[PDB]
Design a protein around this ligand. Structure first.
Ligand SMILES: *[C@@H]1O[C@H](CO)[C@@H](O[C@@H]2O[C@H](CO)[C@@H](O)[C@H](O)[C@H]2NC(C)=O)[C@H](O)[C@H]1NC(C)=O
Ligand SMILES: *[C@@H]1O[C@H](CO)[C@@H](O)[C@H](O)[C@H]1NC(C)=O
Ligand SMILES: *[C@@H]1O[C@H](CO)[C@@H](O)[C@H](O)[C@H]1NC(C)=O
Ligand SMILES: *[C@@H]1O[C@H](CO)[C@@H](O)[C@H](O)[C@H]1NC(C)=O
Ligand SMILES: *[C@@H]1O[C@H](CO)[C@@H](O)[C@H](O)[C@H]1NC(C)=O
Lengths: 402, 403
């Protein structure tokens, strides 16, 4: 692995795959296998009617070209696509377990007061055999502490033994939320007031719940899910997030849907309860809107941002890789970057300038002992009004050659 | 490759993956890629209405287990599955092209008087209009023949010229046959004219069937054309589902034995225009049959009956070939993978239990990591259930004749 800053486009991404939009996408990659999901909506990606959800699993293989390829092996379609939301998948023992939420009022985040917190599970098999292939589970027993209702809320989690750990969130009513507004860091911020951080824990300032991210534990040995909650350090609103394991040490990514826009990732120290030692990263941020744009550090009352995760290639030098959007206040300019917290080593755009691309999921691995990365980017066609997930594969160079 | 007869099951097959039946299956395998097709019928496989027809291509790959696997990459469903019939596929330059017949009166073979000849082509890209192109073929040159049609699972390429297995429907009023050539030398009960009446479906069928090729040339890309090629008189047998394929750089032909000549019909093609095959005088491998033409029959009788059970030439110098055959004189059952010679079965392995019923078998072989592997589509039945499902067995051909 190259560890040297250069402006050379040594990276070469290779794309590897009527009136509708393909949205709410999922990507997990583990030990040769992968899981993906999306929602086919007819019309507006934010408000369109649902056409069909799919969840699939498959294998990650190379051909003679020693380039990874997606090969779907197992696919499930729910008989109603209007009801499945916020799927998260973790891989254990030749099976991929996709934990979804069920709703009759739409997205549990936006009509959150009204949602009876129904969960479920879909286990699909990475290699099908002619219920091994496909099992559904209506989860009924959930342990969530003070939280009024919990929910998975991220693309992928991890296994530890027979215990899965999905990225999840808890909706704690803000009457019971414990926060000293003295801790809200407005020391250098002329504009910031004290209570923003607390009002920044929900969708509205007058949202009824706050959101706190964490994990959902599922111990296969024993079936019951246990909500775990994220540590106070660097506390921001419950957001789509992802736990994954690199080099045998687990790492957490939280998307930055509120004022703290610099990227939130770092090694998890403990998993019960969830403590992450966040990186002091000063180069990778997120595109916001008018109120909380890229690189903002001052506590304001906003909910806005896009999930653009990254993945840790080298621990000792902490080199990491992800697709980020190089736009302040807009979803334009997708870019694949390999970076260090105070420095960006090298990059390559993945589109043209006005290209709009809202979300990016990124998992990396060894293909024949070469470090490759698969990135899902929610790119739009130039005419637009359609979001189509596009999968780029990118080899991480070992030399810093020409 | 082993070349020593043994009763040892050194062969080890590995299966490699609402109210319906999966019938009329297709398999082609070429240079790492594969084509498959089937018809999903609701109910009786013979008389059932059809739900879906899938024409797919994909890649044949191994994982860490060094075993081949199917990986679908491109799939097409026609908007009406009641109208598509007898597809055959050939692979050229990153495109797999499948040639189908179109009918509004059902299977052209069984209602040939009422069938207008309509032909269509589907090209699928094996690594995705590049992905999927349809063509309604309008220009066909068929010589004396009243109507032609593809009739087999796969054919071969030569340059930009594809060669699909096909059949021609020549009305028997224009068929020229000296019944003196009908070989009844040793055959007590066998009359002279059977061979002639044996060239159709009925004795009183209005057409006969003659197998051959359809030639499509890419080089002359303008417009659409298709030229029927008939087959050499030697070992003439009714036009039947057949397959041309290339092994070791020489093309080989397999014709199914749907009439009295029940011993297997295969061998190297000498020429391609017009179609001459030097058939093997093969004495160990025959085809299950109904009462009139039981397996191992060699006497000319008036029958039309048999199952397509092809073989593949693993080794030309010793003519070692591999195929699945049905071990049943008068029933379709007892599917058994065999590797065999002209006058000797070398070694075998059953692929199911004794009553297991398996109507059809397609067999293509290749090198996976420089080892001789074979894929066999076997159209088997799920135990008690009537419905048929195609099952794909992968079988490694041993080089040593070990334990
Ligand atoms: C397929 O079509 C081409 C037509 O271009 C045939 O070969 C060419 O024929 C044209 C004249 O029709 C010549 O200009 C070229 O020199 C020919 N190229 C050759 C012979 O290589 C081609 O032979 C046809 N294939 C078959 C099997 O008939
Ligand atoms: C899962 O349950 C078994 C059953 O007693 C237990 O031994 C194991 O520790 C559990 N896994 C955990 C708690 O992570
Ligand atoms: C985005 O915001 C930061 C901080 O306010 C600023 O440095 C940067 O220049 C802004 N974007 C552009 C395009 O100038
Ligand atoms: C043959 O075609 C005729 C006339 O179109 C039709 O009535 C009959 O059902 C067909 N026979 C079949 C499909 O066996
Ligand atoms: C099938 O027929 C041949 C010769 O007509 C005979 O040798 C063979 O034994 C028959 N099969 C059975 C099961 O008897």
């Amino acid at each position: 692995i190259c560890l040297q800053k250069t402006t050379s486009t040594i990276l070469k991404p290779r794309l590897i795959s009527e009136g509708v939009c393909i949205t709410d996408p999922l990507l997990a990659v583990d030990n040769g296998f992968f899981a993906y999901s999306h929602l086919e909506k007819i019309g507006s990606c934010t408000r369109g009617i649902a056409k069909q959800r799919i969840i699939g699993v498959g294998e990650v293989l190379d051909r003679g070209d020693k380039v990874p390829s997606m090969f779907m092996t197992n696919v499930w379609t729910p008989p109603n696509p209007s009801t499945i939301h916020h799927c998260s998948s973790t891989y254990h023992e030749d099976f991929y377990y996709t934990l979804c939420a069920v709703s009759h009022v739409g997205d549990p985040i936006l009509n959150s007061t009204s949602w009876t917190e129904s969960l479920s599970l879909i286990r699909l098999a990475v290699r099908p055999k002619s219920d091994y292939n496909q099992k559904y589970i209506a989860i009924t027993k959930v342990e969530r502490g003070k939280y009024d209702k919990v929910m998975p809320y991220g693309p992928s989690g991890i296994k530890q033994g027979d215990t899965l750990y999905f990225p999840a969130v808890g909706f704690l009513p803000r009457t019971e939320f414990q926060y000293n507004d003295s801790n809200c860091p407005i020391i250098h911020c002329k504009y910031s007031k004290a209570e923003n951080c607390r009002l920044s824990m929900g969708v509205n300032s007058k949202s009824h719940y706050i959101l706190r991210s964490g994990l959902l534990k599922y111990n296969l040995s024993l079936i019951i899910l246990q909500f775990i909650e994220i540590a106070d350090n660097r506390l921001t609103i419950g957001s789509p997030s992802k736990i994954y394991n690199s080099l045998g040490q687990p790492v957490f990514y939280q998307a930055s849907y509120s004022w703290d826009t610099m990227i939130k990732l770092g090694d998890v120290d403990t998993v019960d309860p969830l403590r992450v030692q966040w990186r002091n990263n000063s180069v990778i941020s997120r595109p916001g809107q008018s109120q909380c744009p890229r690189f903002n550090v001052c506590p304001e009352v906003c909910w806005e941002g896009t999930y653009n995760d990254a993945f840790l290639i080298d621990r000792l030098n902490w080199v990491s890789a992800g697709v980020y959007l190089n736009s302040n206040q807009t979803a334009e300019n997708p870019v694949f970057a390999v970076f260090k917290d105070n420095e960006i080593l090298y990059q390559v755009p993945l589109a043209e300038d006005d290209t709009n691309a809202q979300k990016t999921i990124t998992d990396c691995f060894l293909l024949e002992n070469v470090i490759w990365c698969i990135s899902l980017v929610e790119i739009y066609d130039t005419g637009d009004n359609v979001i189509r997930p596009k999968l780029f594969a990118v080899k991480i160079p070992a030399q810093c050659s020409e």
